[PDB]
């Protein structure tokens, strides 16, 4: 699989979250993902693998922690992607009557 990078910088906050956990054998990847957001403006979206965050490696940082380092950002967010295979995908015209999943979230939102 070829792997990439894409990093986010911008006045705004982002609008995407993240998931798993290496100290739980867990891989890192995007929960949620807003359509036409900051992040989507690098070309990010919801199911690629996560591989490092901030230009620093997620493999010995948690899921917690993961988002500490989003979070930390201060300049510019650096992260990194891979090719996933049959990951997820979502909807584009459901934007049109307002189809969103965002409410009481924000532990791991991002």
């Known amino acids: 699989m070829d792997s990439f990078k894409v990093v986010l910088?911008?006045?705004a906050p982002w609008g995407f979250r993240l998931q798993g956990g290496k100290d739980f054998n867990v891989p890192?990847?995007?929960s949620r993902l807003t359509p036409g957001?900051?992040?989507a403006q690098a070309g990010?979206?919801?199911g690629d693998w996560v591989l490092s965050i901030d230009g620093e490696?997620?493999?010995s940082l948690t899921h917690i922690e993961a988002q500490n380092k989003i979070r930390a950002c201060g300049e510019r967010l650096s992260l990194g992607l891979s090719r996933a295979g049959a990951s997820a995908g979502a909807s584009a015209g459901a934007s049109a009557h307002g189809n969103f999943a965002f409410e009481g979230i924000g532990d791991e939102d991002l």
């Open 9 to 11: 910088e911008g006045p």
């Open 28 to 30: 890192l990847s995007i």
């Open 37 to 39: 957001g900051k992040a």
């Open 44 to 46: 990010v979206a919801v």
């Open 57 to 59: 490696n997620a493999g």
